[PDB]
Design a protein around this ligand. Sequence first.
Ligand code: Q0X
Ligand code: Q0X
Ligand code: Q0X
Ligand code: Q0X
Ligand code: Q0X
Ligand code: Q0X
Ligand code: CL
Ligand code: CL
Ligand code: CL
Ligand code: CL
Ligand code: CL
Ligand code: CL
Ligand code: CL
Ligand code: CL
Ligand code: CL
Ligand code: CL
Ligand code: CL
Ligand code: CL
Ligand code: CL
Ligand code: CL
Ligand code: CL
Ligand code: CL
Ligand code: CL
Ligand code: CL
Ligand code: CL
Ligand code: CL
Ligand code: CL
Ligand code: CL
Ligand code: CL
Ligand code: CL
Ligand code: CL
Ligand code: CL
Ligand code: K
Ligand code: K
Ligand code: K
Lengths: 260, 259, 259, 260, 262, 259
Amino acid sequence: ADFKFEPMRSLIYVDCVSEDYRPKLQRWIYKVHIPDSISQFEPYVTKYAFYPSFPIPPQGDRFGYARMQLTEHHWLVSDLDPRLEIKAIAETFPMDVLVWQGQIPAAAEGNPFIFAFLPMWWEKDLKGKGRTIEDGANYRFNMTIGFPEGVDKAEGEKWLFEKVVPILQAAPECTRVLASAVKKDINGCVMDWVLEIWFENQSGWYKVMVDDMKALEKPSWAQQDAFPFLKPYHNVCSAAVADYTPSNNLANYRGYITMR
Amino acid sequence: ADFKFEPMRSLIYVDCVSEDYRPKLQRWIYKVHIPDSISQFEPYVTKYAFYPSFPIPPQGDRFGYARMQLTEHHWLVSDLDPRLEIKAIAETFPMDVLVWQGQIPAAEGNPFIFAFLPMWWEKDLKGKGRTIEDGANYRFNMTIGFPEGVDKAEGEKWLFEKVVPILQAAPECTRVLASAVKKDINGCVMDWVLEIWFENQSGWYKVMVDDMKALEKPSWAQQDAFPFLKPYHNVCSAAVADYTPSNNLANYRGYITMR
Amino acid sequence: ADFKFEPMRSLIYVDCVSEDYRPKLQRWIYKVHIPDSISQFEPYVTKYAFYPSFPIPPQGDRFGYARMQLTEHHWLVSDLDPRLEIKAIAETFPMDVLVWQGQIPAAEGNPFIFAFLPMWWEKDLKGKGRTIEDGANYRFNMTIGFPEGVDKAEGEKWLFEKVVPILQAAPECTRVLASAVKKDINGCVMDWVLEIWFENQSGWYKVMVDDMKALEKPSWAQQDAFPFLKPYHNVCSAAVADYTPSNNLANYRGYITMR
Amino acid sequence: ADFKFEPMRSLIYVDCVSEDYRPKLQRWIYKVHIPDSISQFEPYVTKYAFYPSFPIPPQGDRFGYARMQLTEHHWLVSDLDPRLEIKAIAETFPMDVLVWQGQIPAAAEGNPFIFAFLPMWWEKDLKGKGRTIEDGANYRFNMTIGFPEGVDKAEGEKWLFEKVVPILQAAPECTRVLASAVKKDINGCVMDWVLEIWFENQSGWYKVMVDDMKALEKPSWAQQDAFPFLKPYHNVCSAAVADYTPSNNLANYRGYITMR
Amino acid sequence: ADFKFEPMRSLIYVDCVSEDYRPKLQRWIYKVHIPDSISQFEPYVTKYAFYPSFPIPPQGDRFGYARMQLTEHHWLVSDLDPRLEIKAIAETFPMDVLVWQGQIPAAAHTEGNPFIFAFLPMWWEKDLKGKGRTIEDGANYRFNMTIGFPEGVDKAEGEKWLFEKVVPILQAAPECTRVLASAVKKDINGCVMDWVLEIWFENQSGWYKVMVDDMKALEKPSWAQQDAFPFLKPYHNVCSAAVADYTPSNNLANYRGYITMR
Amino acid sequence: ADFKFEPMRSLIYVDCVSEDYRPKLQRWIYKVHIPDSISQFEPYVTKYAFYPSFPIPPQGDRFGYARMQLTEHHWLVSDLDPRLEIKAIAETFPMDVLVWQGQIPAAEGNPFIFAFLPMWWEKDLKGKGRTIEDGANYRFNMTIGFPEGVDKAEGEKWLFEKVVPILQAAPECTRVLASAVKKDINGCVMDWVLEIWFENQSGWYKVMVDDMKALEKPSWAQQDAFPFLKPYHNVCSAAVADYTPSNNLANYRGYITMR
Ligand SMILES: O=C(/C(O)=C/c1ccc(O)c(O)c1)c1c(O)cc(O)cc1O
Ligand SMILES: O=C(/C(O)=C/c1ccc(O)c(O)c1)c1c(O)cc(O)cc1O
Ligand SMILES: O=C(/C(O)=C/c1ccc(O)c(O)c1)c1c(O)cc(O)cc1O
Ligand SMILES: O=C(/C(O)=C/c1ccc(O)c(O)c1)c1c(O)cc(O)cc1O
Ligand SMILES: O=C(/C(O)=C/c1ccc(O)c(O)c1)c1c(O)cc(O)cc1O
Ligand SMILES: O=C(/C(O)=C/c1ccc(O)c(O)c1)c1c(O)cc(O)cc1O
Ligand SMILES: [Cl-]
Ligand SMILES: [Cl-]
Ligand SMILES: [Cl-]
Ligand SMILES: [Cl-]
Ligand SMILES: [Cl-]
Ligand SMILES: [Cl-]
Ligand SMILES: [Cl-]
Ligand SMILES: [Cl-]
Ligand SMILES: [Cl-]
Ligand SMILES: [Cl-]
Ligand SMILES: [Cl-]
Ligand SMILES: [Cl-]
Ligand SMILES: [Cl-]
Ligand SMILES: [Cl-]
Ligand SMILES: [Cl-]
Ligand SMILES: [Cl-]
Ligand SMILES: [Cl-]
Ligand SMILES: [Cl-]
Ligand SMILES: [Cl-]
Ligand SMILES: [Cl-]
Ligand SMILES: [Cl-]
Ligand SMILES: [Cl-]
Ligand SMILES: [Cl-]
Ligand SMILES: [Cl-]
Ligand SMILES: [Cl-]
Ligand SMILES: [Cl-]
Ligand SMILES: [K+]
Ligand SMILES: [K+]
Ligand SMILES: [K+]
């Protein structure tokens, strides 16, 4: 049977729940996970990249801040096609990785693995159209949200656009707003939206995403007292990243060369 | 909604209208334009290459000769899909680029010619079976668009029944390939892209200038001699080599400057 | 017209019929064939790799053992689409290559076996979940095609109900994978591709020679022992490693010679 | 005249004095500084790499912790040879870079530029000889020190190797100790030693470098009350880094590709 | 015996004497010469690059203008050490290449131009104008020129002329943004050239204004081999190229074989 | 203190004493040894390459034939300088590697042969001027060390006045190169490295076995026939191709596994 041409960009929000885990998690990612991954999908993934998160900002924990990285893939086919379950070589994946990323708690309950599929192009351009790289360095705050069980999706959308987006648009500190609807049909991801919101720096982020958002009234479905009113790491995940990453893995990886 | 699998090769004819602009245009292309471009389409363009033009030959001006390069992309999806208009980072594009390439004057402006094609040539009209072992080629790539109110079928008939026979008769011409432009993608005025190979500039001239004097002047002619089309508007061209070092998705390592 | 999205993995079984031909065949493959191939299909082939065969094992000749390599491509479109027949530059292909690989004699010629598959194995029959951490594999890749007038369904039933169970039972065998050949693409005579992993040559021999002695000789047998198929015509194979340095779209930098 | 074969490894300790500067400094480093640098020394530098610092640990400020990265070069000739002062193209260097790194304040004192030359091979192997990458992920604490004005160098050396290093050796948390003398003859660097001290993690670092070092008595020349007893960023600089960096710039750099 | 550490930058001035030869010469360079060269010196050459020449400017012929490229190597050891003459695989080098480049004439009837291979230190010895120029300051038209004074001209006198008569005209011209110079290492391979200069402009017009028009003010030296600056015999005592800041042909990093256009 | 500029090429003769060890040895070399090595010497080694050996020829065992590969390094400094003994990260080195290569048995082990040379061959004795255009070479690289108490000058005289003239006379032999081993670096027992080219295995055998029967057996002979030296102890060799894909500082991208 045929395989469908299904170009998509996916994002995984990778946390590191303790600094003591960082060397181990980082080693697994770069030493073990990259080659396993390329080995499997080189023929049908056109880009595979890691975007290390900037230092967690103040109150970033309330946004499900990924303290390790964003993992980004560009697919030509759906990885959730059941035919793609068969692999000559399976990935080397210690259960410890789940501890390091917080999927399993210190045994807190655990945090889910958030793997959001999107179209390759942003669906909505809500602020900053025409911005070039010449305009300067961006503090790029990528955030995914999923409305809690039994909140009507259209009602969540209405909240987002009526209440939240206008505050982003109004803030001179915010230079760019982009959004896409999560493709729910692919893997049953709980998230509904991915937004990217750019600032000049952490202080700008905080002014807008913490101080300006104090004006919002608390929705009836709120799972925390303040914006984003969603349960950290379960219904909201995020990372602040730079414009550039050296970890463009299909082009740039040359093995796990160690420092002398 | 779905995105359609639309594998295509595109060619852009990049001129440099004065030698005094060459350093600036070349810098923009290699220093600024490459990274902006790769940044945008790395996931759905499988090849992105520049083919620097050989020195403009005698009477090359009459063929809309691109004095900088051909720019070549291989796409997996149509770039003219409206959904692809949204970009996180837009390209850095000074207005001066338009002057350098001759789109804007600083007597008359020339259009930006961006022709989409299938990835494989539709017609193989001479030289089938030629290998790289057979020698170095002077590859004359030429695109033409018939003027307003010329029946396309009539233009096609002229091309294939009058023009190509002259190419076939010349032993100096080693290869003829052609494809119809995909006009449905971006409204390009051009109708055909041909590639015509010679051994060298003198062969090109003997055939494309001297042998073509035998053609009679069509009624729609916009100039007295072949190609009878308005330079840079209804005909563009470049002569290029078999190989380019500028295979940008594989070969680019930043704008390293000479010491 | 449209081109169909047709992701496929293909395998070619490349023999070297005499050791005296090995330097010449290897030179052609790496010096001439790689650049010709990349030149043609860079935009619509996502991976192009050679897997050198391990030394031919005892009785390997009876399995149509490829003494040079497996050649592997990953395609986004069918290479047998008639539109893909047209190429600006054709491959440089000396007739001697056919001699070296045994397609023609300098007793009897062997066919060119080019099998198209889906990119993912259809059947996982032993060893699901094996990781690279579990150790080095001796990977025996084997393709078979039932002789003329053997019912395909009957051959399939034999393969999966008689042959594969012997593989499954052997502790020496760590992995069994299989896919049906896509016969609709290029008319390949082969019906199945299997990959069967061992620890080493001795394990391969214990299972593929000694354990297979238990099989009844089918009525259609073309040789007395498993695989009961005519070497190089109805069975081809190679044993290869997990890794190859010849990942050609990523790793090739020209034919640099030893000092 | 001849050029001397002078193989050396150099380290630069690159700070970022405010989180608000991080995007700008990081952009300059990766977008502007890399190509300028490669352009100049590609023919006589065999390796050029950046090692991003792990998050600053508790009390890391007291160690002159470089909040951006270590910059590492391997030279075949001395960069301080006066003939090497001439360059066709000079580096693009906004004065703001000095602000971002803390060399100058915002329009005697910011912090000096610390550029330490070493031999390519560590001179002293004081703990953990034989360690392989198979033995696990390392938290690699690289630290350079320079004794203050009018402290006898031999006396400082004796203190380092007879008082400080024994505490490192006694700690099971410390898996590796390496040291080299700074080549002072190259560029007049104030630093005298570079050490690298490995731990499993941040907690190990802190247990040893803060808690175990409380047992040291305060030298007469001390410029702060606790180990390392040297003035942060002036007489001590440091960074904790991983075994691997994706920023192996002579091999891995493909231009400043921006995230979509 | 020991090999001496001898870091050097070399330049070869590669001409193409007819446009009809360009496809063949270019094919040889990129298809045959690159891999042969890398095969030989990968272990002791740290950079190998080609800088294609800009279109020959007006009166460029009088400057021994190389119509193909500059070839640039960075050596760790002297290639003229006699021990380096032995090579497992020798370069494939048809005598036709010499025709294409103008070293020999095309066909026996009843001199061409010499091969100019100049060794330099890796760093310019003299920075005479434009110190501190960055890439941010804009695109350069980089005119690289090598000169060798004719037989029986005192070298010190030639030097004094160069630096005290010629360079001041460059200094006075606002069109000229950079002047760099090094003495040729004559001890390596007996090259006739004495100096390599690089002189930067914004563009061809600037080059011409300065190197042709402003130089008309020079008086003609007694040793002159032509009436106008540079007063030296084209291709024999003067060679040159105008090149860009950047080349895609950084061959040790960038070469992936002779991939042909579709 | 200073480090001396000491440009050298070194060769290591890597055997594989049983086919059952080949997957494991090959995995260690490509998965573990490459990154460990690059990690250590990237800043002062300009080239690091593996040349896989062709199949062992008839009687190749008598020449200490390396059944895995030649390992080749180009150094800027002496790796045997005692200061280079200190390394942040030591190589991961299972003792089994010594079994696989035959240094240790599962009576007698074979030594590790690591020969340092100048980067350029000292003697060109046949085939000067041969280019890659002249064809594919079967390159037989052989190192020899005269036994204890044989005068070195006498061995040299034998090599160059008795052995090499047989190579010179044979039309099957297209190239002879030789260098003296640098004994001062690491105490290597070997005295010479030669490379001797043929067209193929048959040519190798005709010359190195049949033509060498004419030599009289030296008094110091450790075996009856040429090379008259103890296999793997006083003679080691490999036949290799002109090209290797394993140019490790340029070409390595991690241990990507076959699908
Ligand atoms: O990036 C991760 C990853 O493996 C994604 C992925 C790729 C291919 C698949 O078939 C698939 O199901 C998932 C990733 C990561 O970056 C960190 C982790 O802990 C786990 C991951 O899967
Ligand atoms: O090649 C050019 C180019 O930018 C093509 C292109 C790329 C991405 C798109 O989305 C698109 O619509 C077009 C190009 C060039 O080479 C020179 C120029 O002056 C302008 C160009 O666009
Ligand atoms: O791999 C080979 C190859 O060329 C396959 C192929 C590609 C495109 C086509 O149109 C086609 O018909 C075949 C290959 C090889 O690896 C070795 C050979 O000797 C010949 C080959 O074709
Ligand atoms: O490492 C930096 C740097 O400037 C190095 C250097 C190398 C060679 C020279 O001749 C020279 O003058 C300087 C560096 C860096 O890597 C990051 C920064 O943010 C600032 C730096 O100076
Ligand atoms: O690069 C060229 C070249 O041949 C250099 C060289 C190297 C070693 C030698 O011993 C020697 O004599 C020369 C070169 C080129 O790149 C292009 C040309 O057109 C001509 C050249 O010589
Ligand atoms: O390449 C090998 C190797 O390790 C060489 C080497 C490097 C540095 C040293 O200090 C040293 O003593 C040796 C190598 C190989 O390629 C295969 C092997 O089996 C063993 C090796 O050492
Ligand atoms: Cl913590
Ligand atoms: Cl586990
Ligand atoms: Cl900025
Ligand atoms: Cl709360
Ligand atoms: Cl749809
Ligand atoms: Cl019109
Ligand atoms: Cl008619
Ligand atoms: Cl006209
Ligand atoms: Cl259709
Ligand atoms: Cl044989
Ligand atoms: Cl049959
Ligand atoms: Cl049976
Ligand atoms: Cl039989
Ligand atoms: Cl690549
Ligand atoms: Cl801060
Ligand atoms: Cl002080
Ligand atoms: Cl204090
Ligand atoms: Cl000496
Ligand atoms: Cl400019
Ligand atoms: Cl003269
Ligand atoms: Cl004159
Ligand atoms: Cl590289
Ligand atoms: Cl065996
Ligand atoms: Cl051959
Ligand atoms: Cl002995
Ligand atoms: Cl014997
Ligand atoms: K204390
Ligand atoms: K004059
Ligand atoms: K004998």
